[model samples]
Target: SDAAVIVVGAGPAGMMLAGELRLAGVEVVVLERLVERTGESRGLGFTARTMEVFDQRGILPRFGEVETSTQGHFGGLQFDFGVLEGAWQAAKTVPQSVTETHLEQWATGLGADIRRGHEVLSLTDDGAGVTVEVRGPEGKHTLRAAYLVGCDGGRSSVRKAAGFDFPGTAATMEMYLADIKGVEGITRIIVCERGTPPSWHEVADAWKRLTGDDIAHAEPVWVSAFGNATRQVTEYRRGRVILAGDSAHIHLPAGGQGMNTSIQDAVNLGWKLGAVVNGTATEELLDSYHSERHAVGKRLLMNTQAQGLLFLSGPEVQPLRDVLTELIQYGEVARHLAGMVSGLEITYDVGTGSHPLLGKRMPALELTTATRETSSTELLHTARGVLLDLADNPRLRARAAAWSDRVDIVTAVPGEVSATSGLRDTTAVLIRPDGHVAWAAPGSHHDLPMALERWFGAPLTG
Candidate 1:
């Protein structure tokens, strides 16, 4: 009764979920164990698709001046991000701590109650709702919610308590994965570690050995073992107790995907949970999050493991890396690899769709109306469904009106951006709140109204 939903962890995933819940008019709270953030930055930056996700919600501008680099390493072998036509960059400068701070500010502004040092001791989810027992500075207490999401770190208490099966490979090796300022002779940042493993002197020696950078007196900020482990929860939800972020899955920190994937998991689950708790949609919507993300989690593990073999393995893999390096010169190969890491190539299994845009993240577009011009990204600022009528067909527009309250129907002439988007054949498209195309015109979705109902529920917010 205190909150409609309670999220654990104040990290990127938890904070992002908190903001999303508030966006849909749901009351939410966050619980973080540490009273103060470690000020560490485990993540250097995120992929371009993640940039699009943040931009879709108008959260990108909050960072003063974001400078992205198209050049990045695929398992220590560097490449440029020019494969994706319009999007080709990664936020190399943005620190994980900075991302967390911005997210916390946004969620707090949205009236989210974030209580630090209030660790979630235990939780129970019956069919009706979830009940979480907590331990704070003052005393222990019980709080209830419509749902409970665990965005807590890799060793999730909720996942363990709920008896979720996590079957995967154990970590093969460990290395200093952090921003440390003191490494024998190197200076960068400091960080926490996963376990008793890599020695500072050894890390220091390796740091200098890898790139000839002295690390004896380095300036670091965060810590961890660059793990090669791969694992994931068998299911994302166990009744009203759900899991997101690292709580749901974990893999070797390869190609800058850990943070990006977790954030996306939060985004994918956020809206569906809001719909269920707010009573606009049934619990069936929650099932899609598991089906959609579990497959993605598998891909994440496969690619990252491949990267580890190529980058972290001995000279045995160098021959393979050389072959891949040569192959990468081919646009097709580079594009495939780039799409895999940047999170751009992901497409959902939206029912029966031959159109390329179906189930894909609707590429940001430019549209021109009689009065002005706007970007398709701007249309999702309110975090609601968007039904774009590009053909100026009155009948198509009228049919969408029944779902007006829950969707925004925008009629506009296609601008230059549409040329690259392959939407010329698309007269109308239905976009979900998370920016995925539920329905695209011409071939994929023969029944527009039915497609709308499938995603948006009964018309007019029912």
Candidate 2:
């Protein structure tokens, strides 16, 4: 095989997945058609959960002093995201182009074979593997891999070639975005009306009509036309071909959830795919990617559609918006909406367990190992499953010892636990590479090995 995995596109999702596969020591090749980044900032910022994902991978420092805030919106209804405890405020201004550049550099530094100006012309998933025909600057060539993941944008060629059925609402209106320079402190304007992209002069005229700003002469850095076309594939994977990012789902840009969800999808799928390729897990492990993420994608479509209605509808939605505005005044309403949009509220069914943190993203916690101080976030830098042994139980370590080759067994004590931190009473916890808790002492229904095998595959046999 030319590579263990052939990823299409060099956007945020593709780059993030490349870094993750490289972390697991997998041979990955990323194919991007663009010879250079367009430098157009698409996604303005990332959500709170994305912040934690970056922190776990130690990718946040690349941005260097990210501007974050608790201030955010749902549809156009404003709210405070601070209600979600122990999460980094969503970074509010890092452009998507900058994000792609940083992730590309990081993935390349980690040895990902990123080939620019290479486009996948066609692919064949022959049950056992995939053969992809590509077109590049030099010439056309065929590459083989155990798996192919499509991270190409909404109009994904992989999606079309793989024949996945996409079903959702068609867009009704069009939105225009122009990033202009030489217009002193003039904010970017979003005007929804025309069904197609308008000229720069038309955009400036629309901006003038809407906001009373006349900047027709300003230099346009980038102009884009998009729609609220909401669509999601029925399945995330079909045989050896898989999909992520906008390829898997697309929705209205209600609250910047598109890029953030795409990034998280890559994180969730990366370790599992790596493990399966490396022979630690069975092919059935890959099924969870579709189950877990497809559900999330369903919710992504649902909420984005709902927000689109509330925000884009005429005066008729005003009463509903007023009521929602009043409801958000309550802490619970704000928390629920905040959690949904920030990606903090996701919970997978690892197994039946009474623990609050079970299947939930592990809240950040400081720990003092016998040797040094580290964090749950810091411990995940290697992108391996972490069995946090908080009680110093030799038996706990013994139970997980067979899988020690794949999972990290760390014994540490919590540093000043807070009530909301979710680790106060936990004795031991198993955190997956994506940062979700798989099992915990005094809470999990299944024994240690059961959960261990479920996530990390069968323990080594002597």
Candidate 3:
């Protein structure tokens, strides 16, 4: 009816959602306020789970071979992440600008209409649909769509218009940060305080925060920073409005969680919303996005609080630091802590029979098909559901026939190369468009037809 969905703010979250909606064959348009990208180095890098998410979409190769690190720091004390298996580690060197450029190119190629310089002036939800007032270089205009999502940054206009209540403990600690790149002059000035980061504020204040000396007497140059206040909304969606990325949560920007979390939020909601709009999955599928990401955001809040306490503590907190140091020495302790940071152990509540593989990300695997060898990551290039027949069971293929339009039933056997491979001993598995496993042959949803209907919609019964 309406343009289906109007995604506000064409940042990583918005573009990603746009791309997912496009893949689902739903009409989507992205409205970005900025005429062009700022090329700001805001996000530092991707967490391990994010890499896997990108890989599933076959977007990893767009950037060359990404160098990863098991080595990480806590309170300036560093250690390797060997506790994680499957070679999961954060790729810490890519700039946020670069990631955005790649994603924009990728999504644009996938048929997402991203309009730049279109600022959302105001919004209204009439229970039937959402309407937005927008300003462009040409003139002011109004647009209506079935839904609107705020992927805008912390100061989200859509969030305000939707009246999302954001409540949290006020920040008690403050610190000045420096993120200048080596340019002829400093690449960019970076300063912030308490939970709130700086912007083009009076240099006289930040000069003292950084050097402990005021620059009142001396002329200051490029005395500016970014606005980075830390907070998370009580709800992700209100009425017909939704929020993601910095719009949903903000913190001290420690551990590079902000961008990764935002991207994952888009990935989680994008496909589900796409399905709803495309009439594939019921509107109820959207419920999982809020429940899952809200839980993750709470954990993110707790993790950052602890990291901040350890990293910014004064001399009196040395004992606590030492205790963490001793505890991190154990492999199990490292894995548990690393799991928190790397997102290596995320288990979605996909209903259950407790198969080791249930509700987890489906790892990439090498497969041997009748035609040729293929990596599991290659199968998801179309962004459709994948039913992998690792054992080449014809019955499994026939079982998933009803969803053939939405789910591609691939008949291939595991290469049998390793005992611990993702496909080893697995007969069949259902992978969501987002790469999470919905069901496996040995799992509770082994009743294949039911699981297909549960996730993909009611089966197209003959």
* Per-model TM values vs. the true structure: 0.93, 0.97, 0.89
The digit string of per-residue lDDT tens for model 1 on 1-462 reads 389999999888998899888888889989898998877776878788888888898888788788887786678788876765644656876878898888889889888999999999998878888888899888799888888999998999999999999999988667675455433322353222223352456556665666666665655454445566789989988888888888888887877888899889888888888888878888778899999999888888888888877766667788898988998888887777888888888888888867878888888888886677887899988789998888888898888898888888889887665454657667888899999999878877458888778777777743
Candidate 1: 10-residue stretch with minimal lDDT: 185-194
Worst ten in a row by lDDT for model 3 = 219-228
What ranges in model 3 sit over 4 Å off? 87-89, 179-230, 416-424
Q: How does model 3 score by TM-score?
A: 0.89
C-alpha lDDT (0 to 100) for residue 254 of candidate 3: 69
Q: Best-fitting candidate, measured by TM-score? A: 2
Query: Which residue pairs in model 2 clash with each other?
Result: none
lDDT of each: 0.81, 0.89, 0.76
Best by lDDT: 2
lDDT of 1 at 376: 82
